[PDB]
Scaffold this active site. Structure first.
Site, PDB file in Angstrom:
ATOM      1  N   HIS A   1      -9.793 -37.933   5.107  1.00  0.00           N
ATOM      2  CA  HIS A   1     -10.982 -38.080   5.926  1.00  0.00           C
ATOM      3  C   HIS A   1     -11.761 -36.827   6.316  1.00  0.00           C
ATOM      4  O   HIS A   1     -12.684 -36.901   7.124  1.00  0.00           O
ATOM      5  CB  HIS A   1     -10.663 -38.919   7.158  1.00  0.00           C
ATOM      6  CG  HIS A   1     -11.705 -39.949   7.431  1.00  0.00           C
ATOM      7  ND1 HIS A   1     -11.442 -41.126   8.095  1.00  0.00           N
ATOM      8  CD2 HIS A   1     -13.017 -39.982   7.102  1.00  0.00           C
ATOM      9  CE1 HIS A   1     -12.551 -41.840   8.164  1.00  0.00           C
ATOM     10  NE2 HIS A   1     -13.521 -41.170   7.568  1.00  0.00           N
TER      11      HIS A   1
ATOM     12  N   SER B   1     -20.515 -58.177   5.763  1.00  0.00           N
ATOM     13  CA  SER B   1     -19.299 -58.969   5.640  1.00  0.00           C
ATOM     14  C   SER B   1     -18.101 -58.118   5.244  1.00  0.00           C
ATOM     15  O   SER B   1     -16.970 -58.603   5.269  1.00  0.00           O
ATOM     16  CB  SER B   1     -19.488 -60.090   4.624  1.00  0.00           C
ATOM     17  OG  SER B   1     -19.724 -59.549   3.339  1.00  0.00           O
TER      18      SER B   1
ATOM     19  N   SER C   1     -25.767 -23.651   5.987  1.00  0.00           N
ATOM     20  CA  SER C   1     -25.410 -25.025   6.305  1.00  0.00           C
ATOM     21  C   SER C   1     -24.562 -25.172   7.562  1.00  0.00           C
ATOM     22  O   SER C   1     -25.062 -25.641   8.583  1.00  0.00           O
ATOM     23  CB  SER C   1     -24.713 -25.685   5.113  1.00  0.00           C
ATOM     24  OG  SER C   1     -23.483 -25.066   4.819  1.00  0.00           O
TER      25      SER C   1
ATOM     26  N   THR D   1     -18.004 -15.830   1.466  1.00  0.00           N
ATOM     27  CA  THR D   1     -18.229 -17.164   0.949  1.00  0.00           C
ATOM     28  C   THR D   1     -19.700 -17.419   0.809  1.00  0.00           C
ATOM     29  O   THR D   1     -20.266 -17.318  -0.272  1.00  0.00           O
ATOM     30  CB  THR D   1     -17.654 -18.230   1.880  1.00  0.00           C
ATOM     31  OG1 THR D   1     -16.306 -17.894   2.232  1.00  0.00           O
ATOM     32  CG2 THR D   1     -17.661 -19.580   1.180  1.00  0.00           C
ATOM     33  N   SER D   2     -20.315 -17.749   1.925  1.00  0.00           N
ATOM     34  CA  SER D   2     -21.722 -18.010   1.916  1.00  0.00           C
ATOM     35  C   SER D   2     -22.379 -16.934   1.069  1.00  0.00           C
ATOM     36  O   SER D   2     -22.697 -17.157  -0.091  1.00  0.00           O
ATOM     37  CB  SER D   2     -22.251 -17.992   3.345  1.00  0.00           C
ATOM     38  OG  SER D   2     -21.720 -16.892   4.055  1.00  0.00           O
TER      39      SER D   2
ATOM     40  N   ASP E   1     -53.375 -30.398   8.519  1.00  0.00           N
ATOM     41  CA  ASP E   1     -52.210 -31.214   8.818  1.00  0.00           C
ATOM     42  C   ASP E   1     -52.627 -32.624   8.513  1.00  0.00           C
ATOM     43  O   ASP E   1     -53.804 -32.873   8.266  1.00  0.00           O
ATOM     44  CB  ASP E   1     -51.822 -31.093  10.279  1.00  0.00           C
TER      45      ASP E   1
END
Lengths: 396, 1093, 355
Positions: free
Chosen positions: B623, B498, B237, B948-949, B129
């Site tokens: 979003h 800003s 995921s 899907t996956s 390690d």
């Protein structure tokens, strides 16, 4: 196009007026202006180009290496082999660089022969404009332009990298002094020989313009200049021997400057398609840019006490290292508002009208500077805030 | 040989390990079913118009069933390491935490004690390690060791070493020349006999392996303990994330959540916590102190580390081989030992790189600063000290000295530096320093009279207004100078607050997508509904007197969104279909934008509360990809950048903001990339480099750096196992041009060398290809080359993808990606969503039409299929059941039917462990990537239980397999003489290897052939006994000292840096083709082909 | 000349021996101006820029041409370019009176043979009455330029000439042992070198007393700079050493390595060099340079390079921070805190414009 024409009058007219371009007429028209059959520039004209040369100059001078063609000499009397006359007209330098060369070998003795530097300075050279002929006498007319040539006698290795190094630097310099530097590209349009060194340009209201230049004509002209048995000194590498290279010298143009006042107020279109038409505009120079930093002002009484001490500011100011316009005279001509307008049409940063409010309103550095910050300023801090102003502004 | 074709040439390479025209395609039915089609899918008649040629002549191989020879190749590599691993695995003597120790090794698990490390592990196999300080130096401070024994080092003696402190310069900067001197434990041991492989978890051990590989020679190979985990006990995921929330603090945790800790929780489970870590994090940041704490504990760290190694390991193999391949394993062995060149240039290519992002921002700032300045002011209105002043006044704050304690009551001899205000600590203020000169005055005349009278006037002016002790100790004005606003406080690289400064958008006037308003600063955008509702400014005589009266900033703020008003409406038709502060729409009403409401995926509108005066506004989308809140940012990454380049955006009259949005757009990619990039730091070859004057011929400054950086390519990682190097395995050309708008080139450049590699197209699309075809009876097919059909046709196959979009006449680069996507996981809603956003007003319904359709066309008949997915019909029919491999092999454990599997149980995973699973899809795809998402457009390649996956991963898992062979064969063949050089790459569809210049042509064949084989082999298992030409001879194999796909490129952009390949170093050399390359090499080598060329 | 041979050293003017003669030098015909001269020149002119130009901002930088079409002529009476712009700039200050328009233009005279006279020019325009008053005093003003708080400028002569076609004004000269020389020539064209040039409706020009329109007078304040340094180049001189008026000295300071010696010390000196340069002070390092070049065989060049100080950066400083420096006048090798060295010099500098 008509909107482009109006922008030009705006940015040109203001130059005739407000004295940035000494001469008036056709010899001035864009095309002519760029050629140089113009009478000149206002004092304002001089202050900016001076600031520039000066400002540009500082950068050039800094690094471990730095020198001058040393002289810059209109000159050139002489026959045959050196320069070859081709066409017609005159004998005034066309290569600030050429001279920079004779001075070369000695520039070489300099730095201990050690170095591989950039030998240069600033001065005026002349350009003729000869579209085409036939009519009468022949080859008449002449245009003038004040150039900056940096030569460098570089090894085969400083080479492409040192050239390329310049590319870098030069560009950051412009943006630095540019309000919208995206109008400063480079191309690599030329030569089937000597290879690279790109041309520079600005994005005027009507397209690009050639400004500075940049070649790598590595060691080919010196051989031209100083024949040998394959002679002389080659120049040092640092314990080896080499014949020094070319250094591309963006010429000058008064133009670089010519593009800035552009950039600034160039900014036509600015508000060509946005807000209500109260498009009075103002030119805009980076602070260091502007020829004048401020217009001192004075109003009311006693008329003098106030004209006085403005008198007072000026010197104090004059002294500091700040360009100024003395506004004692100023109280005379116009009425407040157009002062503003002129000034803005002038670039003079802020303006302070010492009036009743000035001692008798005991104190106050009276307001002006835009985005309309008319905040009262005890005269001093601020005065010495401006001293700061420059410093930070300059820096970037 | 010949030229035969029940389909595509195959010739005489086959005869050796295959047959060219030899696939037992059965009579009428089989040969006919395939043919009956395409009358419907419109392909044949003209397919008989080919450009067929090739003349192949190669005898390099032996075996029966190419794969039989593949498992062999896998065999050699896998074996030496199997043996040294074996013994490490069965090893009996557990842990021995002796006192602790100090630097370089020795041993010490002991009957008693230690030492004797004059030089390294004679161990033959171990684990290790490594720690590295926030002294930020990527360099070491201790390395932990097991089977024999080895040890920690100079971190902690380092702490008494020079140079002064933190954040500037210091010694570790010169510690860059430390690299060579240090090694990585030498870096090696000997390469003489058995080489210790190393089992570890992740990175910077990858750093112990930051130095073990580098000198370009070394037969050490490793493999993650975390990788394998992903491989065997891994999670997807979105499922894992949902699984994560509920899991720590309902079906089949057996969570196996990456990292170490959570895996040990599953493999062994005891001493399961973190010996160490509450520490080491409560300042993976404080040092000098470190050693103290270290001495005592760092042995702890070590050990904790060990168990993991040990715990995952002794149990990590068996289950791995519980999914049994030789190749998968050997191919990953070399993947880990990857390489990446570099030269003096990285830091410079990277530093010129750094100079620009600044310029840019620095510049928009002034633009900004100025535009906002101009604006606010020009609007003469109201009364000073209020309204637009408020705006200009906040942003611009400066020349303040009010507070923060410090020095006070103590400090030494001031240089006219005397901050006033200053409150708590600063006020044990005492007498001194004020008086005047005898000395002198400057000019003789009224000047002195005046000059001196002025200071009098001025000086007294001080005794005049304000307070008197501010004077004592004059300020010096904190900071800045012009119109800029300062949040600073935060050091974190690449920041520009800003813009977060809500308001900037009303400034930077911005509406135009969905056409108009201007926006509100960060939420939604007005419109023109001259209400007859909304607005009752109305009257009568009442309004006169009272409207003016106002009452509250509102009637003044209202009057403003109202001047703002008629103008917004007039202003909209004019551009769309083209004042005392209340003239500039955005600015007025917008004051404070844009307010409550919700992002709520609002295709919609805001039912009042919001909603005032003449126009209505749509609280701007979207979003989802953002996922959770209100738009909040106009330049919000994600959707918004897409629209800046997008069809719609603002800055109406000139250069202005277009410059702005456009500018930022340029730099966004780099911001984030920036950090991660600059970070790899590096190590370098000093003098003991590539010998043989090899160093000599190449040409070389000798004043430059020739070291190299190595990135942790997670062996496995991903549930697909594909790869795990955000930065480096996320390589890209440069569409959104600029700094790091790829430093790819700079990446490689060793002088005497060059890098052979290439790109296989749709290495993925083709796999999907034969799969179906092969099971639609004869593997010829439909979608896949049946439908990929012979076609290329001048421009090429993208012209096919192009076919997908033209029928439905549209951009293709946007169309191609979604099929890939269709190929991957679901279809239906996903098309509509994504297409919709990137698309416009057709709304959900029309989106529906298209989504459903596209899906219909390649998979839209009753029950499950027709069109193009008899393969997915199989991926699906073969995989909605049991657990499996991918017809090639290797198993992907987590399973819908299979998570479920000892029959129907427990509410059947709630029946929403499955509905919570209904929710992950779309989000997951715009999320999949942590760095940037779905990628930039013009390329963009990035992709709980249930299809899907699973379906998506089959293709993927299977393209992993793909990678390993290219590799396995090549590694094999390099060994097989004509020696050459190195690398693992396995990047995207790219796989680069390094070679000396000579035999660089040699490798060319290698790669070439290696693919033929891969490809070849795929069909036999997957489909059966045969495959075609086009694929066979790739496109061409690329050779260059540079790293960009399709050489001549030149890569201007980095918009900065861009003299590039002029700015120089290298400049493009072609990829030979297949025909050419063979000509020079002529039947490969030993030392026989040799002279002539 | 004794100085002649030292004068070139590492060429402080471009030109071999016979090339540059004490007459061609007076002809600017010499092969040209060299290295160290310029600094001085850019240095000289500039300080003039203050002289009249910075001092009482009543005047401004005018930009007159170098060439002329039509009758094709050379730039000889640089005093001319101003003439043309008077009208141009008049408009500037309403219509007040008076002031000038300075422009340091490399004018002409190229003696057959040729040469170029850099020069600088001022063109003020005073009214008749207080013309003379605001005239004789003028001499006074820059009378002091060159003298500028002198060293040997206890030798700057001025002669009076009866006449000529202008109305007079006197000339300027310097004490040249070998043979004195004319430095500047101020006139009194109280009369017309306009009028004709700008005839017709005379009321268009002219100026004011204070309330009354009048056509001001014409003046000339030129002598040419090109050699204005040539002179100052003599007060200097009297082992080889060349002392110089601080503020002028093309360069300000120099240094090299020592004791360290290789690598870092040298790198530190350069950085120091760079820092000093940022604000405004010339210098010279001697790093990379592979030889000690001794110290008094290298210091004589400072003399010959009429430098000013030095700063032998050494290792007896890497742990203390103290360099041993000198001056190029009296050698009294001093010790010093190498740092505050920033605000240092400025004193010896800014205050060198004093006494």
């Amino acid at each position: 196009a008509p909107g482009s024409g109006e922008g030009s009058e705006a940015l040109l007219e203001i130059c005739q007026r407000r004295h940035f371009l000494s001469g008036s007429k056709q010899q001035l028209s864009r095309d002519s202006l760029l050629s140089g059959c113009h009478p000149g520039f206002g004092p304002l004209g001089v202050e900016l180009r001076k600031n520039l040369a000066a400002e540009w100059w500082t950068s050039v001078v800094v690094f471990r290496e730095q020198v001058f063609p040393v002289d810059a000499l209109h000159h050139k009397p002489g026959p045959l082999l050196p320069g070859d006359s081709a066409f017609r007209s005159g004998k005034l330098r066309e290569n600030l660089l050429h001279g920079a060369l004779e001075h070369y070998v000695n520039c070489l003795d300099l730095v201990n022969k050690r170095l591989p530097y950039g030998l240069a300075q600033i001065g005026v050279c002349f350009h003729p404009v000869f579209d085409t002929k036939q009519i009468r006498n022949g080859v008449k007319s002449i245009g003038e332009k004040t150039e900056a040539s940096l030569v460098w006698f570089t090894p085969p290795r400083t080479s492409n990298q040192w050239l390329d190094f310049w590319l870098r630097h030069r560009l950051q310099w412009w943006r630095k002094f540019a309000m919208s530097p995206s109008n400063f590209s480079s191309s690599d349009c030329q030569d089937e020989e000597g290879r690279k060194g790109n041309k520079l340009y600005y994005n005027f209201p009507w397209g690009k313009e050639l400004i500075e230049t940049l070649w790598n004509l590595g060691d080919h002209e010196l051989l031209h200049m100083y024949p040998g048995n394959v002679s002389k000194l080659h120049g040092r590498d640092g314990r080896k021997n080499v014949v020094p290279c070319v250094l591309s010298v963006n010429g000058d143009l008064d133009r670089g400057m010519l593009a800035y006042l552009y950039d600034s107020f160039q900014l036509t279109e600015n508000s060509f398609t946005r807000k209500k038409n109260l498009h009075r505009k103002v030119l805009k120079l980076h602070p260091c840019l502007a020829p004048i930093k401020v217009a001192l002002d004075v109003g009311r009484g006693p008329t003098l006490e106030l004209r006085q001490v403005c008198q007072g500011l000026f010197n104090e100011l004059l002294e500091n290292g700040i360009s100024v316009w003395p506004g004692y005279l100023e109280t005379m001509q116009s009425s407040l508002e157009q002062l503003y307008s002129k000034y803005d049409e002038m670039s003079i940063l802020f303006t302070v009208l010492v009036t009743e409010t000035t001692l008798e309103n005991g104190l106050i550095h009276l307001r002006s500077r835009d985005t309309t910050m008319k905040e009262m300023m005890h005269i001093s801090k601020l005065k010495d805030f401006l001293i700061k102003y420059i410093s930070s502004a300059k820096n970037v | 040989r010949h030229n035969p074709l029940d389909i595509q040439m195959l010739s005489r390479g086959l005869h050796e390990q295959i047959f060219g025209q030899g696939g037992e395609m059965p009579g009428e039915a089989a040969v006919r079913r395939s043919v009956e089609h395409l009358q419907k899918h419109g392909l044949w008649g003209q397919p008989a118009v080919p450009l067929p040629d090739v003349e192949l002549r190669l005898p390099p191989l032996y075996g029966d069933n190419l794969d039989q020879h593949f498992r062999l190749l896998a065999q050699k590599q896998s074996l030496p390491y199997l043996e040294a691993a074996n013994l490490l695995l069965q090893a009996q003597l557990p842990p021995k935490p002796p006192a602790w120790a100090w630097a370089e090794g020795w041993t010490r698990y002991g009957p008693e004690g230690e030492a004797v490390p004059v030089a390294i592990p004679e161990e033959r196999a171990l684990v290790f390690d490594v720690e590295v300080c926030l002294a930020e130096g990527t360099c070491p401070t201790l390395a932990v060791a097991i089977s024999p024994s080895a040890w920690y080092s100079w971190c902690s003696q380092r702490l008494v070493e020079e140079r002064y402190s933190w954040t500037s310069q210091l010694s570790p900067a010169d510690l860059i020349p430390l690299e060579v001197p240090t090694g990585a434990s030498s870096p090696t041991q000997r390469d003489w006999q058995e080489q210790l492989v190393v089992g570890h978890n992740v990175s910077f051990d990858r750093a112990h392996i930051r130095e073990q590989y580098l000198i370009q020679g070394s037969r050490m190979r490793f493999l993650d303990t975390m990788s394998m985990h992903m491989a065997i006990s891994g999670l997807s995921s979105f499922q894992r994330s949902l699984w994560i929330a509920a899991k720590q603090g309902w079906d089949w945790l057996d969570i196996s959540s990456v990292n170490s800790n959570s895996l040990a929780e599953v493999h062994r489970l005891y001493v399961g916590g973190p010996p160490k870590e509450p520490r080491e994090l409560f300042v993976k940041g404080t040092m000098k102190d470190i050693r103290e704490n270290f001495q005592d504990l760092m042995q702890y760290c070590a050990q904790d580390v060990w168990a993991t190694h040990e715990v995952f390991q002794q149990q990590l193999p068996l289950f791995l081989e519980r999914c049994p391949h030789p190749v998968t394993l050997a191919g990953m062995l070399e993947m880990g030992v990857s390489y990446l060149p570099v030269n003096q240039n990285w830091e410079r290519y990277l530093a010129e790189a750094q100079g620009t992002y600044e310029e840019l921002q620095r510049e928009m700032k002034k633009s900004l600063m100025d535009l906002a300045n101009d604006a606010c002011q020009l609007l003469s209105g109201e009364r000073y000290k209020e309204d637009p002043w408020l705006w200009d006044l906040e942003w611009d704050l400066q020349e303040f000295k009010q507070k923060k304690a410090k020095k006070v009551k103590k400090e030494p001899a001031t240089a006219s530096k005397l901050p006033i205000e200053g409150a708590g600590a600063p006020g044990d203020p005492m007498d001194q320093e004020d008086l005047g000169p005898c000395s002198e005055e400057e000019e003789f005349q009224q000047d002195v009279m005046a000059r001196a009278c002025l200071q009098k006037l001025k000086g007294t002016t001080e005794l005049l207004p304000k307070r008197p002790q501010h004077l004592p100790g004059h300020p010096g004005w904190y900071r800045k100078l012009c119109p800029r606003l300062d949040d600073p406080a935060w050091t974190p690289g690449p920041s520009l607050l800003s813009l977060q400064m809500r308001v900037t958008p009303k400034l930077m006037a911005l509406t135009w997508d969905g056409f108009p308003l201007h926006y509100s600063e960060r939420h939604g955008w007005g419109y023109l509904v001259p209400g007859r509702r909304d607005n009752l400014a109305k009257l009568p005589t009442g309004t006169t007197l009272e409207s003016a009266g106002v009452v509250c900033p509102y009637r003044a703020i209202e009057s403003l969104y109202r001047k703002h008003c008629l103008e917004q409406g007039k202003q909209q038709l004019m551009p769309q279909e083209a004042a005392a502060v209340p003239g500039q729409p955005l600015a007025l009403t917008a004051r404070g934008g844009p307010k409550d409401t919700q992002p709520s995926y609002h295709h919609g509108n805001g039912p009042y509360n919001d909603v005032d005066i003449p126009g209505c506004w749509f609280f701007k989308l979207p979003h989802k990809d953002g996922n959770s809140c209100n738009v909040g940012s106009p330049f919000a990454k994600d959707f918004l950048p897409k629209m800046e380049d997008g069809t719609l955006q603002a800055g109406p009259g000139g250069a202005s903001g277009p410059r702005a949005l456009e500018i930022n757009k340029m730099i966004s990619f780099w911001r984030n990339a920036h950090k991660r990039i600059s970070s790899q730091m590096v190590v370098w070859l000093p003098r003991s480099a590539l010998p043989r004057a090899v160093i000599r011929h190449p040409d070389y400054d000798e004043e430059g750096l020739y070291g190299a950086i190595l990135p942790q390519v997670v062996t496995a990682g991903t549930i697909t196992r594909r790869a795990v190097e955000p930065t480096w395995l996320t390589a890209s050309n440069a569409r959104p041009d600029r700094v790091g708008s790829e430093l790819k080139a700079m990446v490689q450049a060793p002088p005497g060398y060059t890098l052979v590699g290439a790109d296989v197209d749709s290495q993925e699309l083709w796999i999907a290809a034969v799969l179906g075809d092969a099971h639609f009876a004869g593997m010829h097919g439909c979608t896949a080359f049946g439908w990929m059909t012979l076609q290329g046709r001048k421009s090429r196959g993208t012209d096919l993808h192009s076919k997908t979009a033209t029928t439905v006449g549209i951009s293709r680069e946007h169309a191609k990606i979604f099929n890939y996507g269709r190929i991957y996981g679901a279809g239906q809603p996903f098309a509509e969503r994504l297409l919709m956003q990137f698309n416009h007003r057709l709304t959900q319904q029309e989106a529906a039409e298209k989504a459903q359709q596209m899906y219909a066309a390649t998979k839209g008949l009753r029950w499950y299929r027709l069109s193009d997915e008899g393969e997915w019909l199989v991926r699906e029919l073969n995989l909605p059941v049991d657990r499996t491999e991918g017809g090639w092999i290797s198993l992907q454990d987590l399973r819908k039917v299979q998570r479920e599997t000892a029959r129907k149980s427990q509410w059947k995973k709630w029946e929403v462990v499955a509905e919570r699973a209904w929710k992950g899809g779309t989000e997951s795809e715009m999320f999949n990537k942590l760095e940037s998402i779905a990628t930039s457009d013009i390329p963009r390649t990035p992709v709980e239980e249930f299809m899907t996956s699973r379906v998506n991963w089959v293709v993927q898992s299977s393209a992993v397999d793909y990678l390993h062979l290219m590799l396995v064969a090549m590694k094999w063949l390099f060994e097989e003489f004509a020696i050459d050089g190195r690398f693992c790459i396995s990047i995207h569809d790219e796989v680069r290897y390094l070679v000396r210049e000579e035999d660089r042509y040699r490798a060319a064949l290698a790669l070439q052939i290696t693919n033929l084989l891969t490809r070849c082999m795929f069909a036999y298992k997957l489909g059966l006994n045969d495959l075609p030409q086009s694929v066979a001879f790739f496109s061409a194999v690329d050779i260059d000292r540079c790293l960009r796909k399709e050489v001549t490129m030149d890569c201007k952009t980095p918009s900065n840096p861009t003299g590039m390949e002029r700015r120089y170093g290298i400049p493009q050399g072609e990829a030979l083709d297949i025909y050419q390359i063979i000509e020079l090499t002529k039947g490969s080598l030993e030392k026989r082909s040799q002279p002539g060329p």
